[PDB]
Symmetry: D5
Subunit: 100 residues, 10 copies
């Protein structure tokens, strides 16, 4: 019997395409396992893969959502990325398997 | 796929019509993207547009809502304006489209 | 175009009808405007009208909801009064409708 | 007219039947009045009645629920007792009814 | 007549199989009694049983669920194990049953 | 025997002399008693005395300090008025000393 | 040897001599042991002695300081009582001996 | 008889001279009035003067301290600027006068 | 060079001699190293040594102070035990090498 | 004129030489400038330098102190490293200099 839910939360970094400087973030994933739990090692790998990558955080959220789906194919996955830029607090959510 | 939700939060200022003096506020916008995400620089410009402008926090929330719809036309947007006035904590909310939670 | 929801929160005072002592509270009002937003100055007046009034907080929440309904007639109001009495934290909520 | 909802929260104590030792707790009650508001005085008596009584918090919660139901017969009541024992944070909830019946 | 819901929360530890080091956790259990309440003392022994045991937290949450179901056969139980590994905050949940819909 | 220190904190209001609107504040008072503790009722009256009065919070802090001194003559008093004006958090402190036994 | 410092904190109640109603408080005790530590049971008895007693919190703080001094004679003790009365937060401090640096 | 200490806190903005992008900050000032209390309007104008100015936050703090000294000459002033850049929380303090 | 200061904090438990029951606590140690830094594993072992031991939290603090002194001999050590007992929050401090 | 004090705080990571596993940390540096301010970009690279490095957090604090002193020789520096390991909250402080007393 697998867990019914896993939540993962960690910090990461990427390169902001506009400024071209390092943009730190906090990322959260929540998923319902379907016969496979994502190794913590592998998740960190996915998050650290964005270091030095020019990518906007909106596309980071969706990209990581796609990675988790390709790795363990859960019926429900939510990814939230939180960061700060030019005095604004920003959160972007990507979600697959929620309401239609 | 687009993100399913974006939340933005920042501080701004306007001129209060009743007191005739500068009033601080905190503003949050939550929206369901459809196509492009609102650039943060653009959001900051919208909020900054109210500096020096005499406008009630009720009307500012509604105005900002219409500015976000004009720019990125999301199916759902909610704007919340929080401020402190004469010892009263005030939140004003302006919302267009269907409930997300 | 009215906003779709307003939240107001502030401190006030009443008089405890048993001891005749000042009884401090925090009050939160939440309403859906229908074409009229209650002016903050008017809200403060309503809350301040309870100074010197002997009234239990259970009745004040109901009384205040009535003042708001009569002033701006919203379709949904909720009034929450919080206070602390004989070592009990009390919240009293008075409503009218869904959300 | 009655309030639509009341919440009450206070501290109390009982005696742990294992060690015969004082067993402090926090208790919260929420209920929907139906024609009758429980006096705060009377709630505090109900809570203080457990002082020096040997009773498990699992039983106290249910006992207090019954007491509130007997005093004001609300359509909904929920009693929560929170305490600390052998390094374990415990909450016991006892709940009755709902809206509608 | 028993409670409607009990929530228990405490700290524990196991041994991480990959690094052979102590893997500290917080565990939360919530359940609906059906004519048996889980004694707190029995709960704390279940949780302490993992001290020195090599077991992934994903397995631990499920194992502890199975322990609680076996002790009191409740119609609903949820176990949540929170730990911190390689800079990642982890929460693993195991569930069984629930309240059928308040019709 | 009297306490070594008392701290009091409450909310009040005054009138901003420029705008003539309500200027809400939080006020904290610390004092070392000299044989005599200020009644709370009397402190509340002092604070409530600024209601409707046009005065700057600078001045208020000092005025209240003087009222406390005139009433129970402590060898040490400190008054702190905190308010929020044109998006600036402001704290004004006034303090006064003397000799003990 | 003894500890260098103990701090204790708990809630109590007394009866307000003006309103005659139960008057809740928080009390902290800090002291430097000299050869003996106050048993927690003993402390809780002291704090519970005020239940049902008409006493001002300012008098209570000093009274509890004396009880502590009588029980275990520490070279430094400080007692702080915090309560809420007519919209004012009150802290009363009673202190005895040379103060920590 | 005037105040023994004033504490002011607010938000502002400057322009980062490397990135040329908006560099948002919180500023705290405390000072001992001697004679003169700084008008809040006037303090606010000091802080707002940095908006659209290319100035590093270490310079700004010092610049603002001199402004408060030039306006009201207190025997003690302390200015703290807090900001966030590339994932680092930064506080710059510029302090003058005071007995020990 | 050694660090100038170390703080450790963790949870543990003992057995209350009054009630006979397990008594949980939080413990903090602060020391100035002189040569030796206490291995965290070793600290954990000292705090875990109190499990199933009948001891008052007052004595516990002093006992752990003497263990740390015995292990790494710092010129300054402070131990603080915090617990909750019969509705009373309790903090006990033991200190070695401050002003006497 | 230089600032009187600068505080920097960020998150980093290293590898525990005992367990061989990544440990996350928060690090704060506080210093008094003497006519050189450490550019932020430089501080960030000092902290990033520990990623994958097998080093005890005790040694990290002292090693980072020494990097700040070498780079800008301030008359006071304090480095604090905070982390969590086997259920223990740890803070290591490395400190050099100060304000010379009157």
């Amino acid at each position: 019997k697998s867990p019914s839910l896993v939540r993962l939360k960690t910090r990461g970094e990427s390169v902001c395409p506009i400024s071209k400087t390092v943009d730190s973030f906090e990322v959260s994933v929540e998923y319902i396992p379907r016969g496979a739990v994502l190794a913590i090692e592998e998740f960190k790998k996915m998050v650290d893969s964005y270091r030095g990558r020019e990518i906007l955080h909106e596309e980071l959220a969706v990209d990581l959502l796609e990675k988790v789906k390709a790795a363990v194919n859960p019926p429900y996955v939510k990814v939230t990325v939180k960061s700060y830029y030019i005095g604004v607090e920003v959160e972007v959510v990507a979600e697959s398997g929620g309401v239609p």
